[PDB]
């Protein structure tokens, strides 16, 4: 995948999602979770000033915020998924943004990137991958 901006500034809204249940299974999400969550439309916000990022990705369940700095390792308590500690460090490859979780879990991250006027999100753990693309709800520029 290439980005063809760093600029992720903006709410974006879910239109695909691949693999979520693979994912959330290899993170011993619960069955009943699993069954609630899989389909549920997202949004995601994203507030970046630089290095600072602050996002916040909603559905009618439940939300998953998180608040980084590019290029600064921090302890992320996963409290709306699988309640465990990882030391996150999100860091760019070209205009690919990349966050590896590193824990009990391998294989642990994502990656997210502007494609045009779309935000697609890869998610990792083990041997599990899930796919998503978001449309274009607003951006600043």
Known sequence: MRGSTRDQNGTWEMESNENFEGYMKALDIDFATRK???????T?????????????TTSTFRNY???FTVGVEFDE???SL???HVKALVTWEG???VCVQKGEKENRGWKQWI???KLYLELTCGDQVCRQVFKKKLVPR
């Open 65 to 67: 915020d998180v608040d």
């Open 115 to 117: 494609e045009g006027d």
């Open 95 to 97: 205009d690919v943004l």
């Open 77 to 79: 308590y996963t409290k």
């Open 44 to 56: 995601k916000v994203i507030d970046q000033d630089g290095d600072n990022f602050k996002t916040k």
């Open 36 to 42: 609630i969550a899989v389909r549920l439309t997202q």
């Open 82 to 84: 699988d309640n465990r």
